[PDB]
Amino acid sequence: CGIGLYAHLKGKQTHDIVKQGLKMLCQLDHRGGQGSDPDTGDGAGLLVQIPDAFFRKECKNINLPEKERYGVGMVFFSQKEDERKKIEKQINALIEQEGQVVLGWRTVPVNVGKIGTVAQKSCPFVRQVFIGASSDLKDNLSFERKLYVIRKQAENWGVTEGLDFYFASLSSQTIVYKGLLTPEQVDAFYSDLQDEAFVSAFALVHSRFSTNTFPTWERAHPNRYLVHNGEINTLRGNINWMRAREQQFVSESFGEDLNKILPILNADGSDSSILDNAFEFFVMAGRKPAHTAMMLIPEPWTENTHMSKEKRAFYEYHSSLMEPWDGPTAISFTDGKQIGAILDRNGLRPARYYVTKDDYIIFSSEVGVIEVEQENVLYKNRLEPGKMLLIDLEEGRIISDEEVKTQIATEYPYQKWLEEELVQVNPDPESREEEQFSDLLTRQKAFGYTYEDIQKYLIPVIKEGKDPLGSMGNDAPLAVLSDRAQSLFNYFKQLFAQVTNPPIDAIREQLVTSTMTWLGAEGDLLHPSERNVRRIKLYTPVLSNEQFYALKTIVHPDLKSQKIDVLFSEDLERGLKDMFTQAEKAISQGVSLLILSDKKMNERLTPIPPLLAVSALHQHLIRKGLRTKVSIIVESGEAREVHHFAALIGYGADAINPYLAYATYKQEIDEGRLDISYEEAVSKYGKSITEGVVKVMSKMGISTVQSYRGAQIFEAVGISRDVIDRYFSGTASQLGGIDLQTIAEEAQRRHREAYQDDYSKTLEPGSDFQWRNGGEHHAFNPKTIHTLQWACRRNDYNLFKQYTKAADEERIGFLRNLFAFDGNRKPLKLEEVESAESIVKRFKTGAMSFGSLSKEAHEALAIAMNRLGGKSNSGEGGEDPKRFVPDENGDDRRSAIKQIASGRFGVKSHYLVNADELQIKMAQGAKPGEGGQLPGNKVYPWVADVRGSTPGVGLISPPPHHDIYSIEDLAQLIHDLKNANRDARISVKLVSKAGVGTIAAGVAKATADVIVISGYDGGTGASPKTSIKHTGLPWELGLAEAHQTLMLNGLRDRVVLETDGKLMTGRDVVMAALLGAEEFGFATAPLVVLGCVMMRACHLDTCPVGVATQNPELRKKFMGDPDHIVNYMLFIAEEVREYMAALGFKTFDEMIGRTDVLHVSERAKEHWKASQLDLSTLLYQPEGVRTFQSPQNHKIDQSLDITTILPAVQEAIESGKEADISIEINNTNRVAGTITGSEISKRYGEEGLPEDTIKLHFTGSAGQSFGAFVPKGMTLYLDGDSNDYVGKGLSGGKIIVKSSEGFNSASDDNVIIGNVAFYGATSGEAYINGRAGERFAVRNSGVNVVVEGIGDHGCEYMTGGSVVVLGDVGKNFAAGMSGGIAYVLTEDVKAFKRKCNLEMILFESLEDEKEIQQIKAMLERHTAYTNSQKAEDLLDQWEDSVKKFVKVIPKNYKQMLASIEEQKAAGLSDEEAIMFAFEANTK
Amino acid sequence: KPTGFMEIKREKPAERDPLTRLKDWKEYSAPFSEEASKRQGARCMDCGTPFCQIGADINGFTSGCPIYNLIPEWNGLVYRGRWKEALERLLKTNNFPEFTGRVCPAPCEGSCTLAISDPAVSIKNIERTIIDKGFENGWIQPRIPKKRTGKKVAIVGSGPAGLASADQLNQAGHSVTVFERADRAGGLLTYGIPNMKLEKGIVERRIKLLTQEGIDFVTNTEIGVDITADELKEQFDAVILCTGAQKQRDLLIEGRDSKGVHYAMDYLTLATKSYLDSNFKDKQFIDAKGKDVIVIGGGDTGADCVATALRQKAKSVHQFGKHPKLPPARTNDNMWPEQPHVFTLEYA
Ligand SMILES: Cc1cc2nc3c(=O)[nH]c(=O)nc-3n(C[C@H](O)[C@H](O)[C@H](O)COP(=O)(O)OP(=O)(O)OC[C@H]3O[C@@H](n4cnc5c(N)ncnc54)[C@H](O)[C@@H]3O)c2cc1C
């Protein structure tokens, strides 16, 4: 999988370029995954110029005119011929009507026998049509426009008629050959390519991954204009905005053709296809390709101080008319005479290119793509973020990004337009009116406020400036299942970025985010001038009362406002329709602001659910082409939570005004509490809410509220598909659910009780994150907790039976509780079913970090699992090596499963090898799309030593896996982990959500042994309450979808399915097995057995039972025993055995997948809203295998390490003797050393081997993950270059990379290393002879490196080690730096400081003799091993080099080190000195 | 991150010396001071799923507050110093907190998370302090329900259940009537419960507040021969039955016929009635200052009888009980969620 392009700068056309392009595709094929069979083409394509010579030679009948006056089509047709000639006749008729001449038609030869069975079956008929331009069209742009119009008309006619034909390409300068073909199969299929007449100045190439095993020929790309690598996470919003703007579009170039080309985008197309359609439409509209690319994927201008004034003005101006297309994207577009390449704003994809002395450019994701002559290579560079690589064939030169951007920005006076046309809403200062109602309690009851809600969400927000944290994720039932009336917000769950796109850290990458919002009417997008920026702009969507009043009282005729009371009595549909009519009337009158208000509501008039109202109005205006002319303000009392604000924004709201929350704050201030003033309280609330919304966007990876607003990142749970289509189009609802009448009934009920409420003047206590008598049901209620504890302590069975009965029946807590067994079968005896000893082997204790838990609880769980034969999971906090050896008494504290998270804290070669399963935590239930933060006060020495960090220094776990930016990266990481431990099972832990089945299929293609599905009810030690409650979906839907999709794609037998999330009973285990889960996870219940009483205070480090705290005093109160866990697991297994006997099932494999045994219970039908759910989606059994059989054959064999290195290194490792060997390496050799490192670690362990014992030289270009998990004793040399992930998880050893001896250019100017390097590294050293890419030393924890320049986000989350940079540094340096030291050599200290992040670092100078000597020795080693001219010059001028060097060190790190050194000088031992310093600095 | 339960130790409020406490028939305890109440409320952790609120029978014994008191909420309010809000939240559930603050044995204290390996928080004392402060500041006044719909419920019995039902119906808007046999209303509280544990002044004040509300109590009525169920139903829509449980089982053994054996209920009723009427000077009760007292059958009644005898200065007083003595610590089969069954050494 990937993209590439081989081109000649001057425009010389040859066939060797095409041959080389197919060679690059063949080389890149290794990145893609493996499907059902290898022979089937996953998807590939090749774009080239028009082959005039070949066409002239091969036609012999059609009179082809000169180059630019005729065009060539390319059509995929169905095998049927009648419709084929029908479409041909229609196309000819359209061409004649447009006036262009039909030169003729041709049929492309196809070698079907060279293709796989599925692609053979789906192979279409390939026919081209030739168009000749009329004499009237003087310029080629008009001819291209005519062809575009013809193609759009043909596509519209085809979709209207229902015919299935595709226009792969129709242009006068470009031709595309693509399909479900492998790189080797492309040339064989297209016999034309073999002919030498094929000549083109450039050749672009793409190969796909095809997450699902059912791709289509049409969906393959290169598309008509560009190739896109990655994913788009704002697709819904982009589509909606584009279809709203298309109606208002007016262009002179197209004239009346706009009606013909109205659809613009294809609804059923993919993200890449839609992006290509938008790009081509904007190009024909009169915009240059570079301008269109910049407008579609703008650079981050908000919060970015590294951008010039002209560029900032340009991007700010274009943000008023085009929202960003966010996501990881690498785009390469071409228009025949111009070629361009760009990356997304955050630069999350790799792109390296070579420029040769013979005017040839080779650009691709990988670097070792073709064989090149070093003496011929001129430049080895990479595509930097915010930089466009542009080539003009006619001009025969590469146009500088600076020149392109400067020209485009200066072409108009954007800054002057912004300064002049901006409108100010400066409010009056004496109009202050602190609003109070005197019916505050009644309104609070009506909108669902509670004393818990206030005291635990509103006051903490003011106090802390952030959304309050929590623990023990939601155990309460869903809104659709709860008897109590619930708000419509609770029916929608936040989505998140799991795979195919990573999340982002908004705090650390604030320079990439933007909360800017535009209010008003958009101008003429196609022909913009001045009026496009004659609107209001806000930095925060949350509006204070004064701002709301000012907006209402603007009065400006150009900026008019209208207020609509969203209230209803009986007919919600009627209310919505009156709102629609009022909006249309206001728009006709010229209003540009619509203010939906819940105020002026009484017992007779209840407010419409603001989410429903906003969504319905947004959809209606989008359909009618009027949304872009207005903006939506909401004034509702049901808006007090980050989830509420995020839902409103994502479903269409432009601004919100929480007047009732402000009134509550005012009342609290007036009654004595909350001494802070009303104004500061309001401002703090607004800022905190905006930050929470930004975090919610970061969960999915969206960096801009503008895109998030259109995008719908929420999935409904319990809403009818009819209602969804009417008002929430594009949203997912697997089971449908309640209807508009039920929603209105719930709202009316809440309003009526609140308004009557004639007994009490107090708010009822909440039950969302706590249990209250008479409140909402909680699965872990006191009765269940005490019953389970008593049963486990007795080793008694009837108590456990009572606990199981209470947990399962008497309330509806989960979806699975709605199912009942058939009860009409042949019951067997308990002796005819498999034993509990075999059953328990499928159970696990779940991941729980050592820091989050206590040592006693962790070791107890591990001991219980090992004794029972199951598997225990070590969290992201690492593991103690002493636990790998069983105790004398026989108890084993080792964790069978080792977790890999974004932090990579304890990740090491020893840590990985000493395991049976390696899990990859892509997301967890409570905080799927978020990371973590461990304060220094919580970083105790016994935790810091385990995690390889400094005590008292904060630790940050980034949300995303910086390796995993896509499914291909996930596959690469799986391959690296398998290399590290070939005798281990690779697991991937995901969280249930829509599309999780397709993601699981993609994972199986990526060759993951185990797939784990986690429900949103899963626990955690610390997470935001909004993330706990409103993020994720139940594991039932995800498990069912994954099972069905895997069985359909024929991959179920290759993977093992596991589930977790509120598995408390054998009935739950049985239901999971029937849904298709082979393994089950249990985390919370073991804690309750150990003593947890669901205090939900894990994040406070104050557990009274010494379970989730590191305090010795509380740990002394720990009374848990592994025997209780053993008894709990055995009781669960006995329950499963009894259920299997009742159902007549003899084995777990036999029962798995048998959903026919289940039927909807009468309780669900009796329920007034759970009876409207369609559970047939879960009750479905496709034909296929329902159990893991195939062992998921990896590619460990045929690897370089196995073939060459190991056979010549095993004896040396065994004998402990030196051994030096040399190999030639290409990009297909990815890891190249991890297996040897794992063998060394297994033989010896942490001590490894003596330094410079094993020496491995490599010549050429290396693949991804070079030198990963290399322990001490190994020294890798690389003469050439390397790709991303160099030194990943380094556990010692040496890595040296030197430029090829034949490359005479400046290494410090030339790029030699990929983006991510030494991510999660713990120990070792490295020496890089050249520039690196983005995110260099992301999570280094002791590795010392010397590098001649790096990219952006350097030393992001370092906690230890040192970094020496002999060159420039990218922006956002040291973003998250909590430990370690960075030394940078530069001439402009001011520029370096501006580039760096100033939050948590200090700037110093090299004054310490020891530090100076260490740096000098490092440079001496670097120059000895590299022959670096820069290092030699610096050593010669050492006196000036020290003066001009710059030092970066975290404040807390420096203070802790100074305190420890002072205590050591005073004469205190290491442990006691560390403890005293930690206490002093964290008192 | 509160650490009160770690850095604070449980204490008790001012208590009169037992030796001098027998000279007067007054309260045997006092509410917490402001600082002590704040310190004790700091101990509460704002319990996740508070076990001090379940209010249910576990293994045949009640655990938690049966009335679902917002114990963590007013604990936090007391710690923060908000007394009006604490009183309001308390009254949201308990309409007679004054009695419970000095009478309830506090099963909530036993069934609390902090009860494991450490003493529980003085929930009863905090409640008593809150209600006492409210009464002293005069924040408790009749609500005077403006809405009154003609409806009669005619509750029978002046016990706490009767008073609570009367208050709830009156606030709803129904004019109810409470019939009591004895001269003074209050059910067990007025007579059965000793003045020592609960002086009747607060009870009388509560009945005065209820009368101002409009309950319209009527006393000296057995509602038997005096008033018949037929006319009761004819003149009332609902009648309720808050008759309580005063029947006392006896021992069908020989020797229980010699004069000198009287019911504990009758003895306590006579003693308290004489104390209220003429300060035990009318000699219309049983006095054993120079006579030995043997009370058989332990519990609250036995403790009250022993205290009454001690204040009467009986030469010898003894308590008999068949069940074995409780141990000083929880047993293996008795952990925190269950009501503790350990040695108490309560008053008397
Ligand atoms: C610390 C403590 C100590 C306790 N000590 C005792 C104790 O010593 N003795 C004891 O018995 N309980 C004792 N209890 C229990 C408690 O007093 C009772 O459980 C409770 O008060 C009775 O509730 P009630 O609403 O039925 O009140 P009651 O007083 O039982 O309500 C009914 C009242 O109406 C009267 N009545 C009866 N028939 C009629 C009728 N036909 N018409 C009108 N009125 C009628 C009854 O005599 C009674 O006064 C104690 C509890 C605690 C916590």
Ligand SMILES: Cc1cc2nc3c(=O)[nH]c(=O)nc-3n(C[C@H](O)[C@H](O)[C@H](O)COP(=O)(O)O)c2cc1C
């Ligand atoms: C205290 C605690 C800490 C946890 N820590 C992690 C973690 O670090 N990584 C992770 O992937 N899951 C973590 N989990 C989630 C569980 O490991 C497991 O995936 C699942 O969510 C448990 O669901 P359950 O609580 O309903 O049994 C944690 C859960 C708890 C209760």
Ligand code: SF4
């Ligand atoms: S002391 Fe009682 S009320 Fe307070 S947190 Fe503990 S169990 Fe809950």
Ligand code: SF4
């Ligand atoms: S002492 Fe108070 S809070 Fe505790 S159970 Fe008794 S009435 Fe409820």
Ligand code: F3S
């Ligand atoms: S919820 Fe957490 S704080 Fe302790 S009692 Fe349970 S581990």
